[PDB]
Design a binder for this molecule. Structure first.
Ligand SMILES: Nc1ncnc2c1ncn2[C@@H]1O[C@H](COP(=O)(O)OP(=O)(O)O)[C@@H](O)[C@H]1O
Ligand SMILES: [Mg+2]
Lengths: 352, 61, 62
DNA sequence: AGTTGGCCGCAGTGTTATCACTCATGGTTATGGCAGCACTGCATAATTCTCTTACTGT
Protein backbone atom coordinates (compact mmCIF):
# COMPACT_ATOMS: atom_id res chain seq x y z
CA UNK A 1 0.00 0.00 0.00
CA UNK A 2 2.73 2.47 -0.92
CA UNK A 3 1.04 5.80 -1.54
CA UNK A 4 0.95 7.71 -4.82
CA UNK A 5 4.16 9.58 -4.05
CA UNK A 6 6.01 6.48 -2.85
CA UNK A 7 5.10 4.51 -5.98
CA UNK A 8 6.02 7.43 -8.25
CA UNK A 9 9.38 7.72 -6.49
CA UNK A 10 10.07 3.98 -6.72
CA UNK A 11 9.25 3.79 -10.42
CA UNK A 12 11.16 6.97 -11.28
CA UNK A 13 14.32 6.14 -9.33
CA UNK A 14 14.31 2.58 -10.70
CA UNK A 15 13.95 3.79 -14.30
CA UNK A 16 16.70 6.39 -13.79
CA UNK A 17 19.16 3.49 -13.46
CA UNK A 18 19.53 3.48 -9.67
CA UNK A 19 19.94 0.01 -8.20
CA UNK A 20 16.79 -1.52 -6.74
CA UNK A 21 18.17 -2.71 -3.39
CA UNK A 22 19.53 0.68 -2.32
CA UNK A 23 16.26 2.16 -3.59
CA UNK A 24 14.45 -0.10 -1.11
CA UNK A 25 16.92 0.88 1.61
CA UNK A 26 16.36 4.58 0.92
CA UNK A 27 12.56 4.28 0.89
CA UNK A 28 12.45 1.87 3.84
CA UNK A 29 10.56 -0.85 1.97
CA UNK A 30 11.15 -4.56 1.57
CA UNK A 31 13.11 -5.57 -1.52
CA UNK A 32 10.43 -8.04 -2.61
CA UNK A 33 7.73 -5.38 -2.23
CA UNK A 34 9.72 -2.82 -4.23
CA UNK A 35 10.53 -5.32 -6.97
CA UNK A 36 6.87 -6.34 -7.23
CA UNK A 37 5.89 -2.67 -7.50
CA UNK A 38 8.48 -2.14 -10.27
CA UNK A 39 6.21 -4.04 -12.67
CA UNK A 40 2.90 -2.55 -11.58
CA UNK A 41 0.49 -0.29 -13.51
CA UNK A 42 -0.24 2.39 -10.91
CA UNK A 43 0.26 3.13 -7.19
CA UNK A 44 -1.72 0.68 -5.05
CA UNK A 45 -3.10 2.54 -2.02
CA UNK A 46 -6.69 1.31 -1.73
CA UNK A 47 -8.29 -1.78 -0.18
CA UNK A 48 -11.95 -2.61 -0.81
CA UNK A 49 -13.97 -4.42 1.87
CA UNK A 50 -17.71 -5.07 1.91
CA UNK A 51 -20.13 -4.64 4.79
CA UNK A 52 -19.98 -6.89 7.85
CA UNK A 53 -22.38 -8.20 10.46
CA UNK A 54 -23.25 -6.04 13.46
CA UNK A 55 -25.12 -6.41 16.76
CA UNK A 56 -28.37 -4.62 15.78
CA UNK A 57 -28.96 -6.71 12.65
CA UNK A 58 -31.67 -9.05 14.04
CA UNK A 59 -33.52 -6.11 15.61
CA UNK A 60 -33.16 -3.88 12.55
CA UNK A 61 -36.38 -5.02 10.78
CA UNK A 62 -38.36 -4.57 13.99
CA UNK A 63 -36.96 -1.08 14.56
CA UNK A 64 -37.69 -0.17 10.94
CA UNK A 65 -41.28 -1.36 11.36
CA UNK A 66 -41.60 0.70 14.54
CA UNK A 67 -40.31 3.81 12.79
CA UNK A 68 -42.30 3.40 9.57
CA UNK A 69 -45.68 2.37 11.03
CA UNK A 70 -45.71 3.54 14.66
CA UNK A 71 -43.84 6.80 14.00
CA UNK A 72 -41.57 6.25 16.99
CA UNK A 73 -38.25 8.08 16.73
CA UNK A 74 -37.35 8.19 20.45
CA UNK A 75 -34.03 6.37 20.70
CA UNK A 76 -34.58 5.77 24.42
CA UNK A 77 -37.93 4.06 23.83
CA UNK A 78 -36.68 1.84 21.00
CA UNK A 79 -33.56 0.98 23.00
CA UNK A 80 -35.63 0.03 26.04
CA UNK A 81 -37.90 -2.11 23.86
CA UNK A 82 -35.13 -4.01 22.03
CA UNK A 83 -33.12 -4.46 25.23
CA UNK A 84 -35.82 -6.84 26.45
CA UNK A 85 -35.67 -8.66 23.10
CA UNK A 86 -32.01 -9.44 23.77
CA UNK A 87 -29.89 -6.49 22.66
CA UNK A 88 -26.97 -5.67 24.96
CA UNK A 89 -25.03 -2.86 23.27
CA UNK A 90 -25.15 0.90 23.63
CA UNK A 91 -27.41 3.48 22.04
CA UNK A 92 -24.81 5.06 19.73
CA UNK A 93 -25.23 2.35 17.08
CA UNK A 94 -28.99 2.72 17.34
CA UNK A 95 -28.83 6.49 16.84
CA UNK A 96 -26.43 6.09 13.92
CA UNK A 97 -28.68 3.55 12.19
CA UNK A 98 -31.83 5.59 12.86
CA UNK A 99 -30.42 8.96 11.78
CA UNK A 100 -31.13 8.52 8.02
CA UNK A 101 -34.81 7.80 8.70
CA UNK A 102 -35.21 11.07 10.60
CA UNK A 103 -36.62 14.10 8.82
CA UNK A 104 -34.13 16.60 7.42
CA UNK A 105 -34.40 19.82 9.42
CA UNK A 106 -34.71 22.83 7.15
CA UNK A 107 -31.46 24.61 6.38
CA UNK A 108 -30.78 28.24 7.27
CA UNK A 109 -28.12 29.16 4.71
CA UNK A 110 -29.66 30.99 1.75
CA UNK A 111 -28.04 31.09 -1.68
CA UNK A 112 -28.04 34.45 -3.45
CA UNK A 113 -28.60 34.88 -7.20
CA UNK A 114 -28.37 37.87 -9.54
CA UNK A 115 -30.34 37.45 -12.75
CA UNK A 116 -29.18 38.93 -16.04
CA UNK A 117 -30.67 42.22 -17.29
CA UNK A 118 -34.09 41.86 -18.87
CA UNK A 119 -34.09 38.14 -18.13
CA UNK A 120 -36.34 37.50 -15.13
CA UNK A 121 -39.40 38.87 -13.37
CA UNK A 122 -41.36 37.73 -10.31
CA UNK A 123 -45.07 37.95 -9.51
CA UNK A 124 -47.15 37.42 -6.39
CA UNK A 125 -50.39 38.19 -4.55
CA UNK A 126 -51.05 39.55 -1.06
CA UNK A 127 -54.47 39.09 0.55
CA UNK A 128 -54.81 42.46 2.28
CA UNK A 129 -58.08 41.48 3.95
CA UNK A 130 -61.73 42.47 4.00
CA UNK A 131 -62.68 46.16 3.91
CA UNK A 132 -65.96 48.08 3.67
CA UNK A 133 -65.34 50.13 0.53
CA UNK A 134 -68.35 52.35 -0.23
CA UNK A 135 -70.50 50.32 2.14
CA UNK A 136 -69.57 47.08 0.35
CA UNK A 137 -67.46 44.31 1.87
CA UNK A 138 -64.83 43.17 -0.63
CA UNK A 139 -61.70 41.05 -0.29
CA UNK A 140 -58.85 43.36 -1.25
CA UNK A 141 -55.77 41.81 -2.85
CA UNK A 142 -52.46 43.34 -3.89
CA UNK A 143 -50.67 42.21 -7.05
CA UNK A 144 -46.91 42.81 -7.06
CA UNK A 145 -44.53 42.46 -10.02
CA UNK A 146 -40.81 42.83 -9.27
CA UNK A 147 -38.13 42.96 -11.94
CA UNK A 148 -35.10 40.82 -11.17
CA UNK A 149 -32.14 42.88 -12.39
CA UNK A 150 -33.32 46.46 -11.75
CA UNK A 151 -35.52 45.58 -8.75
CA UNK A 152 -38.34 47.73 -10.12
CA UNK A 153 -41.74 47.33 -8.49
CA UNK A 154 -45.20 47.61 -10.01
CA UNK A 155 -48.26 47.00 -7.88
CA UNK A 156 -52.03 47.23 -8.16
CA UNK A 157 -55.03 46.55 -5.95
CA UNK A 158 -57.91 44.33 -7.02
CA UNK A 159 -61.09 42.75 -5.66
CA UNK A 160 -60.52 39.25 -7.07
CA UNK A 161 -57.75 36.81 -7.92
CA UNK A 162 -59.32 35.29 -11.03
CA UNK A 163 -57.17 34.24 -13.98
CA UNK A 164 -58.65 37.19 -15.86
CA UNK A 165 -57.49 39.62 -13.17
CA UNK A 166 -54.08 37.95 -13.07
CA UNK A 167 -53.62 38.29 -16.83
CA UNK A 168 -54.81 41.90 -16.81
CA UNK A 169 -52.40 42.78 -14.00
CA UNK A 170 -49.62 41.13 -15.99
CA UNK A 171 -50.57 43.30 -18.98
CA UNK A 172 -50.41 46.37 -16.74
CA UNK A 173 -46.99 45.33 -15.43
CA UNK A 174 -45.63 44.74 -18.94
CA UNK A 175 -46.91 48.12 -20.08
CA UNK A 176 -45.41 49.76 -16.99
CA UNK A 177 -41.97 48.24 -17.57
CA UNK A 178 -42.14 49.02 -21.30
CA UNK A 179 -41.65 45.39 -22.27
CA UNK A 180 -42.05 41.73 -21.38
CA UNK A 181 -39.37 39.65 -19.61
CA UNK A 182 -37.86 36.46 -20.95
CA UNK A 183 -38.94 34.59 -17.79
CA UNK A 184 -41.70 35.14 -15.23
CA UNK A 185 -41.71 33.37 -11.87
CA UNK A 186 -44.96 32.59 -10.05
CA UNK A 187 -45.92 30.34 -7.18
CA UNK A 188 -48.07 27.24 -7.65
CA UNK A 189 -51.38 28.96 -8.39
CA UNK A 190 -54.11 27.04 -10.20
CA UNK A 191 -54.52 30.03 -12.52
CA UNK A 192 -51.05 29.12 -13.85
CA UNK A 193 -50.75 25.35 -13.24
CA UNK A 194 -52.87 22.29 -12.49
CA UNK A 195 -50.61 20.30 -10.16
CA UNK A 196 -47.32 18.41 -10.36
CA UNK A 197 -47.87 15.50 -12.76
CA UNK A 198 -45.27 13.25 -11.14
CA UNK A 199 -42.70 15.99 -10.59
CA UNK A 200 -43.35 17.79 -13.88
CA UNK A 201 -45.70 20.79 -13.96
CA UNK A 202 -48.86 20.92 -16.07
CA UNK A 203 -49.52 24.44 -17.33
CA UNK A 204 -53.04 25.79 -17.54
CA UNK A 205 -53.88 25.73 -21.24
CA UNK A 206 -55.31 29.25 -21.38
CA UNK A 207 -52.42 30.68 -19.37
CA UNK A 208 -49.94 28.78 -21.52
CA UNK A 209 -51.54 30.32 -24.61
CA UNK A 210 -51.31 33.74 -22.97
CA UNK A 211 -47.62 33.25 -22.21
CA UNK A 212 -46.87 32.03 -25.73
CA UNK A 213 -48.73 35.09 -27.00
CA UNK A 214 -46.59 37.53 -25.03
CA UNK A 215 -43.52 35.30 -25.39
CA UNK A 216 -42.53 35.19 -21.72
CA UNK A 217 -41.61 31.76 -20.36
CA UNK A 218 -43.41 30.85 -17.11
CA UNK A 219 -41.71 29.21 -14.16
CA UNK A 220 -42.88 27.97 -10.77
CA UNK A 221 -40.57 27.84 -7.77
CA UNK A 222 -41.69 24.75 -5.84
CA UNK A 223 -44.44 23.58 -3.48
CA UNK A 224 -44.15 25.25 -0.07
CA UNK A 225 -40.98 27.24 -0.75
CA UNK A 226 -41.38 31.01 -1.12
CA UNK A 227 -37.69 31.83 -0.65
CA UNK A 228 -37.02 31.34 -4.36
CA UNK A 229 -39.06 34.50 -5.02
CA UNK A 230 -37.73 36.57 -2.13
CA UNK A 231 -37.57 39.78 -4.15
CA UNK A 232 -41.32 40.11 -4.58
CA UNK A 233 -42.19 38.89 -1.07
CA UNK A 234 -39.83 41.47 0.44
CA UNK A 235 -41.34 44.10 -1.85
CA UNK A 236 -44.74 43.06 -0.49
CA UNK A 237 -43.44 43.58 3.04
CA UNK A 238 -42.08 46.96 1.96
CA UNK A 239 -45.39 48.09 0.48
CA UNK A 240 -47.57 46.74 3.29
CA UNK A 241 -45.40 48.34 5.99
CA UNK A 242 -44.80 51.64 4.14
CA UNK A 243 -47.84 52.47 1.96
CA UNK A 244 -50.78 50.48 3.38
CA UNK A 245 -50.23 51.11 7.08
CA UNK A 246 -52.02 54.39 7.73
CA UNK A 247 -53.19 55.52 4.30
CA UNK A 248 -56.97 55.94 4.15
CA UNK A 249 -59.13 55.57 1.06
CA UNK A 250 -62.71 55.21 -0.15
CA UNK A 251 -62.31 54.14 -3.80
CA UNK A 252 -59.98 51.55 -5.32
CA UNK A 253 -59.19 53.96 -8.16
CA UNK A 254 -57.98 56.49 -5.59
CA UNK A 255 -55.90 53.80 -3.88
CA UNK A 256 -54.30 52.75 -7.17
CA UNK A 257 -53.55 56.37 -8.07
CA UNK A 258 -51.90 56.92 -4.69
CA UNK A 259 -49.98 53.66 -5.03
CA UNK A 260 -48.60 54.53 -8.47
CA UNK A 261 -47.63 58.02 -7.31
CA UNK A 262 -45.91 56.56 -4.24
CA UNK A 263 -44.04 54.01 -6.32
CA UNK A 264 -42.79 56.56 -8.85
CA UNK A 265 -41.88 58.93 -6.01
CA UNK A 266 -39.99 56.70 -3.56
CA UNK A 267 -40.31 52.98 -4.27
CA UNK A 268 -38.72 53.03 -7.73
CA UNK A 269 -36.55 56.03 -6.78
CA UNK A 270 -34.88 55.11 -3.50
CA UNK A 271 -31.65 53.17 -4.15
CA UNK A 272 -31.73 49.50 -3.26
CA UNK A 273 -29.95 48.21 -0.18
CA UNK A 274 -28.01 45.62 -2.22
CA UNK A 275 -27.64 46.99 -5.75
CA UNK A 276 -26.97 50.41 -4.23
CA UNK A 277 -28.47 52.30 -7.17
CA UNK A 278 -31.77 53.92 -8.08
CA UNK A 279 -34.03 51.29 -9.71
CA UNK A 280 -34.90 53.62 -12.61
CA UNK A 281 -31.28 53.72 -13.82
CA UNK A 282 -31.17 49.93 -13.92
CA UNK A 283 -34.54 50.01 -15.67
CA UNK A 284 -32.91 52.20 -18.31
CA UNK A 285 -30.26 49.46 -18.44
CA UNK A 286 -32.96 46.80 -18.89
CA UNK A 287 -33.68 45.36 -22.35
CA UNK A 288 -37.18 43.87 -22.42
CA UNK A 289 -38.86 42.34 -25.44
CA UNK A 290 -41.29 44.65 -27.26
CA UNK A 291 -44.98 44.56 -26.46
CA UNK A 292 -47.56 43.45 -29.04
CA UNK A 293 -49.72 46.21 -30.46
CA UNK A 294 -52.98 44.56 -29.39
CA UNK A 295 -53.27 43.32 -25.82
CA UNK A 296 -54.57 39.84 -25.03
CA UNK A 297 -58.25 40.56 -24.46
CA UNK A 298 -59.01 39.71 -20.83
CA UNK A 299 -62.77 40.14 -20.58
CA UNK A 300 -65.54 37.83 -19.43
CA UNK A 301 -67.20 36.21 -22.46
CA UNK A 302 -70.75 34.94 -21.98
CA UNK A 303 -73.51 33.92 -24.37
CA UNK A 304 -77.05 35.10 -23.62
CA UNK A 305 -80.46 35.07 -25.27
CA UNK A 306 -82.64 38.09 -25.97
CA UNK A 307 -86.20 37.95 -24.68
CA UNK A 308 -89.26 37.99 -26.92
CA UNK A 309 -89.82 41.74 -26.70
CA UNK A 310 -86.12 42.57 -27.08
CA UNK A 311 -85.20 43.12 -23.44
CA UNK A 312 -81.75 41.67 -22.74
CA UNK A 313 -80.59 41.14 -19.15
CA UNK A 314 -77.04 40.73 -17.87
CA UNK A 315 -76.34 40.49 -14.15
CA UNK A 316 -78.56 43.06 -12.43
CA UNK A 317 -78.82 45.15 -15.60
CA UNK A 318 -81.23 45.60 -18.49
CA UNK A 319 -81.02 46.85 -22.09
CA UNK A 320 -83.43 47.52 -24.96
CA UNK A 321 -82.33 45.82 -28.17
CA UNK A 322 -83.87 46.27 -31.61
CA UNK A 323 -86.58 43.79 -32.59
CA UNK A 324 -84.25 42.08 -35.07
CA UNK A 325 -82.17 40.88 -32.09
CA UNK A 326 -85.12 39.31 -30.22
CA UNK A 327 -85.06 35.63 -29.35
CA UNK A 328 -81.52 35.14 -30.69
CA UNK A 329 -78.13 34.43 -29.12
CA UNK A 330 -75.63 37.22 -28.48
CA UNK A 331 -72.20 37.59 -26.89
CA UNK A 332 -71.68 39.88 -23.89
CA UNK A 333 -68.03 40.91 -23.66
CA UNK A 334 -67.58 42.38 -20.18
CA UNK A 335 -64.27 44.18 -19.80
CA UNK A 336 -62.81 44.29 -16.31
CA UNK A 337 -63.48 48.04 -16.15
CA UNK A 338 -67.22 47.40 -16.64
CA UNK A 339 -67.42 48.25 -20.36
CA UNK A 340 -70.02 45.76 -21.58
CA UNK A 341 -70.28 45.31 -25.35
CA UNK A 342 -72.81 43.20 -27.26
CA UNK A 343 -71.90 41.22 -30.37
CA UNK A 344 -74.11 39.30 -32.80
CA UNK A 345 -72.28 37.12 -35.34
CA UNK A 346 -69.25 39.43 -35.35
CA UNK A 347 -71.32 42.59 -35.65
CA UNK A 348 -71.61 45.03 -32.74
CA UNK A 349 -75.04 45.94 -31.36
CA UNK A 350 -75.92 49.58 -30.72
CA UNK A 351 -77.60 48.57 -27.47
CA UNK A 352 -79.82 51.21 -25.88
CA UNK B 1 -65.48 8.32 -43.13
CA UNK B 2 -68.08 7.77 -40.41
CA UNK B 3 -68.72 11.51 -40.20
CA UNK B 4 -68.72 11.66 -44.01
CA UNK B 5 -71.97 13.10 -45.41
CA UNK B 6 -73.33 13.25 -41.84
CA UNK B 7 -71.66 16.11 -39.95
CA UNK B 8 -69.22 18.92 -40.74
CA UNK B 9 -65.57 18.73 -39.75
CA UNK B 10 -63.44 21.78 -38.95
CA UNK B 11 -59.79 21.11 -39.78
CA UNK B 12 -56.85 23.46 -39.25
CA UNK B 13 -53.25 22.70 -40.20
CA UNK B 14 -50.11 24.09 -41.82
CA UNK B 15 -49.19 21.15 -44.08
CA UNK B 16 -50.15 20.90 -47.74
CA UNK B 17 -52.45 18.15 -48.97
CA UNK B 18 -49.50 16.22 -50.42
CA UNK B 19 -47.81 15.76 -47.03
CA UNK B 20 -50.69 13.68 -45.63
CA UNK B 21 -49.23 10.45 -47.00
CA UNK B 22 -46.01 11.21 -45.14
CA UNK B 23 -47.75 12.28 -41.93
CA UNK B 24 -49.94 9.16 -41.76
CA UNK B 25 -47.26 6.94 -43.30
CA UNK B 26 -49.61 5.73 -46.04
CA UNK B 27 -50.29 7.17 -49.49
CA UNK B 28 -53.59 5.58 -50.51
CA UNK B 29 -55.04 5.93 -47.01
CA UNK B 30 -54.31 9.67 -47.01
CA UNK B 31 -55.66 9.94 -50.55
CA UNK B 32 -58.96 8.38 -49.49
CA UNK B 33 -59.14 10.50 -46.34
CA UNK B 34 -58.72 13.65 -48.44
CA UNK B 35 -61.12 12.41 -51.13
CA UNK B 36 -63.83 12.13 -48.48
CA UNK B 37 -62.89 15.22 -46.45
CA UNK B 38 -62.70 17.48 -49.53
CA UNK B 39 -65.83 16.31 -51.38
CA UNK B 40 -68.17 18.75 -49.61
CA UNK B 41 -65.93 21.44 -48.14
CA UNK B 42 -64.87 25.08 -48.31
CA UNK B 43 -61.08 25.35 -48.11
CA UNK B 44 -59.52 28.60 -46.89
CA UNK B 45 -55.81 29.10 -47.57
CA UNK B 46 -54.27 31.79 -45.36
CA UNK B 47 -51.15 33.38 -46.84
CA UNK B 48 -49.08 35.60 -44.56
CA UNK B 49 -46.69 35.59 -41.63
CA UNK B 50 -46.88 34.73 -37.95
CA UNK B 51 -49.06 37.44 -36.44
CA UNK B 52 -47.62 37.58 -32.93
CA UNK B 53 -44.05 38.32 -34.06
CA UNK B 54 -44.00 39.42 -37.69
CA UNK B 55 -47.14 41.56 -37.74
CA UNK B 56 -46.15 43.58 -34.68
CA UNK B 57 -42.55 43.90 -35.87
CA UNK B 58 -43.60 45.15 -39.31
CA UNK B 59 -46.35 47.48 -38.05
CA UNK B 60 -44.38 49.13 -35.23
CA UNK B 61 -41.97 50.56 -37.83
CA UNK C 1 -66.37 21.31 -25.90
CA UNK C 2 -62.86 20.84 -24.44
CA UNK C 3 -61.64 23.96 -26.21
CA UNK C 4 -58.22 25.10 -24.95
CA UNK C 5 -59.62 28.62 -24.57
CA UNK C 6 -62.46 30.88 -25.74
CA UNK C 7 -62.14 33.24 -28.70
CA UNK C 8 -64.44 34.91 -31.21
CA UNK C 9 -64.39 36.77 -34.52
CA UNK C 10 -64.68 40.02 -32.56
CA UNK C 11 -60.98 39.82 -31.63
CA UNK C 12 -60.00 39.08 -35.25
CA UNK C 13 -58.53 41.62 -37.67
CA UNK C 14 -59.18 40.97 -41.36
CA UNK C 15 -56.79 43.74 -42.39
CA UNK C 16 -53.89 41.53 -41.26
CA UNK C 17 -55.31 38.68 -43.40
CA UNK C 18 -56.39 40.38 -46.65
CA UNK C 19 -55.62 37.38 -48.87
CA UNK C 20 -58.89 35.61 -48.00
CA UNK C 21 -62.28 37.27 -48.28
CA UNK C 22 -63.92 38.54 -45.11
CA UNK C 23 -67.45 38.00 -46.42
CA UNK C 24 -67.03 34.22 -46.67
CA UNK C 25 -66.16 33.92 -42.97
CA UNK C 26 -69.17 36.06 -42.04
CA UNK C 27 -71.30 33.72 -44.16
CA UNK C 28 -69.85 30.73 -42.31
CA UNK C 29 -70.92 32.43 -39.09
CA UNK C 30 -74.51 31.91 -40.30
CA UNK C 31 -73.88 28.16 -39.80
CA UNK C 32 -75.28 27.29 -43.22
CA UNK C 33 -72.53 24.67 -43.52
CA UNK C 34 -74.04 22.60 -40.70
CA UNK C 35 -77.05 21.83 -42.90
CA UNK C 36 -74.96 21.19 -46.02
CA UNK C 37 -72.58 19.02 -43.94
CA UNK C 38 -69.65 20.68 -45.73
CA UNK C 39 -66.22 20.58 -44.09
CA UNK C 40 -64.27 23.75 -43.29
CA UNK C 41 -60.50 23.68 -43.74
CA UNK C 42 -58.03 26.35 -42.63
CA UNK C 43 -54.53 26.03 -44.08
CA UNK C 44 -51.63 28.41 -43.56
CA UNK C 45 -48.29 28.99 -41.85
CA UNK C 46 -48.05 28.69 -38.06
CA UNK C 47 -49.45 31.50 -35.95
CA UNK C 48 -51.56 32.97 -38.75
CA UNK C 49 -54.81 32.58 -36.78
CA UNK C 50 -56.04 29.15 -37.91
CA UNK C 51 -57.07 27.83 -34.49
CA UNK C 52 -58.52 31.24 -33.62
CA UNK C 53 -60.99 31.16 -36.52
CA UNK C 54 -61.78 27.48 -36.01
CA UNK C 55 -62.60 28.00 -32.34
CA UNK C 56 -64.62 31.12 -33.15
CA UNK C 57 -66.79 29.16 -35.58
CA UNK C 58 -67.11 26.37 -33.03
CA UNK C 59 -68.24 28.91 -30.44
CA UNK C 60 -70.86 30.24 -32.83
CA UNK C 61 -72.08 26.68 -33.35
CA UNK C 62 -72.19 26.03 -29.59
C1' DA D 1 -80.87 -54.76 41.32
C1' DG D 2 -78.78 -52.72 37.14
C1' DT D 3 -75.25 -52.09 33.72
C1' DT D 4 -71.37 -53.48 31.24
C1' DG D 5 -68.13 -56.70 29.68
C1' DG D 6 -66.86 -61.16 28.11
C1' DC D 7 -67.87 -65.46 26.06
C1' DC D 8 -70.48 -68.25 23.14
C1' DG D 9 -73.28 -68.85 19.41
C1' DC D 10 -75.09 -67.32 15.27
C1' DA D 11 -74.94 -64.85 11.14
C1' DG D 12 -72.74 -62.45 7.62
C1' DT D 13 -69.07 -61.69 4.39
C1' DG D 14 -65.22 -62.85 1.20
C1' DT D 15 -63.08 -65.68 -2.43
C1' DT D 16 -63.29 -68.95 -6.16
C1' DA D 17 -65.79 -71.51 -9.51
C1' DT D 18 -69.78 -71.92 -12.16
C1' DC D 19 -74.32 -70.50 -14.21
C1' DA D 20 -77.83 -67.46 -16.00
C1' DC D 21 -79.71 -63.23 -17.51
C1' DT D 22 -79.64 -58.72 -19.21
C1' DC D 23 -77.92 -55.15 -21.91
C1' DA D 24 -75.90 -53.30 -25.89
C1' DT D 25 -75.35 -52.76 -30.91
C1' DG D 26 -76.91 -52.99 -35.63
C1' DG D 27 -80.57 -52.40 -39.18
C1' DT D 28 -85.18 -50.63 -40.72
C1' DT D 29 -89.37 -47.93 -40.23
C1' DA D 30 -92.32 -44.35 -38.23
C1' DT D 31 -93.49 -40.35 -35.41
C1' DG D 32 -92.81 -36.18 -32.65
C1' DG D 33 -90.44 -32.31 -31.27
C1' DC D 34 -87.58 -28.72 -32.07
C1' DA D 35 -85.82 -25.22 -34.77
C1' DG D 36 -86.12 -21.28 -37.86
C1' DC D 37 -88.26 -16.90 -39.39
C1' DA D 38 -91.06 -12.89 -38.65
C1' DC D 39 -93.22 -9.47 -35.66
C1' DT D 40 -94.04 -7.17 -31.22
C1' DG D 41 -93.17 -5.77 -26.36
C1' DC D 42 -90.56 -5.09 -22.20
C1' DA D 43 -86.62 -4.38 -19.48
C1' DT D 44 -82.03 -3.35 -18.77
C1' DA D 45 -78.03 -1.01 -19.74
C1' DA D 46 -75.82 2.74 -21.56
C1' DT D 47 -75.70 7.41 -22.43
C1' DT D 48 -76.81 12.22 -21.47
C1' DC D 49 -77.74 16.12 -18.47
C1' DT D 50 -77.26 18.56 -14.25
C1' DC D 51 -75.30 19.36 -9.79
C1' DT D 52 -71.98 18.65 -6.40
C1' DT D 53 -67.65 17.19 -4.73
C1' DA D 54 -62.63 16.46 -4.56
C1' DC D 55 -57.61 17.71 -4.71
C1' DT D 56 -53.55 20.75 -4.09
C1' DG D 57 -51.34 24.98 -3.12
C1' DT D 58 -51.28 29.78 -1.51
N1 LIG E 1 -55.57 37.75 -37.72
C1 LIG E 1 -55.48 37.73 -36.36
N2 LIG E 1 -56.18 38.60 -35.59
C2 LIG E 1 -56.10 38.59 -34.24
N3 LIG E 1 -55.31 37.73 -33.56
C3 LIG E 1 -54.55 36.81 -34.21
C4 LIG E 1 -54.60 36.76 -35.67
N4 LIG E 1 -53.77 35.78 -36.06
C5 LIG E 1 -53.24 35.23 -34.95
N5 LIG E 1 -53.70 35.85 -33.84
C6 LIG E 1 -53.31 35.49 -32.46
O1 LIG E 1 -52.43 34.36 -32.54
C7 LIG E 1 -52.96 33.25 -31.81
C8 LIG E 1 -53.47 32.20 -32.78
O2 LIG E 1 -52.43 31.44 -33.39
P1 LIG E 1 -52.84 30.03 -34.05
O3 LIG E 1 -53.66 30.33 -35.28
O4 LIG E 1 -53.41 29.18 -32.95
O5 LIG E 1 -51.44 29.38 -34.52
P2 LIG E 1 -51.35 27.81 -34.82
O6 LIG E 1 -52.44 27.56 -35.84
O7 LIG E 1 -49.95 27.64 -35.36
O8 LIG E 1 -51.60 27.17 -33.48
C9 LIG E 1 -54.08 33.80 -30.96
O9 LIG E 1 -53.61 34.08 -29.64
C10 LIG E 1 -54.52 35.06 -31.66
O10 LIG E 1 -54.93 36.07 -30.73
MG1 LIG F 1 -48.50 33.68 -3.85
Amino acid sequence: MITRGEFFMIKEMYERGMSISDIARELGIDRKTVRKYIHSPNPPSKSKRKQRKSKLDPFKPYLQKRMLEDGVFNSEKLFFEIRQQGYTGGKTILKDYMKPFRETAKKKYTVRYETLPGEQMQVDWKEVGEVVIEGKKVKLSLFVATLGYSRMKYAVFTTSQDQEHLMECLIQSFKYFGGVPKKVLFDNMKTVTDGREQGVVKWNQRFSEFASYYGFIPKVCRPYRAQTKGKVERAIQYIMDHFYVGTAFESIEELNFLLHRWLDQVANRKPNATTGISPQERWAEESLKPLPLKDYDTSYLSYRKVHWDGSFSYKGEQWLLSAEYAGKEILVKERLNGDIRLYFRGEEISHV
Amino acid sequence: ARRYEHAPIILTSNKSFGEWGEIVGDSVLATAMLDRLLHHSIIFNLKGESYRLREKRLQEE
Amino acid sequence: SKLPYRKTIDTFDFTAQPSVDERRIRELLTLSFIDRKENILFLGPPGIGKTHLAISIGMEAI
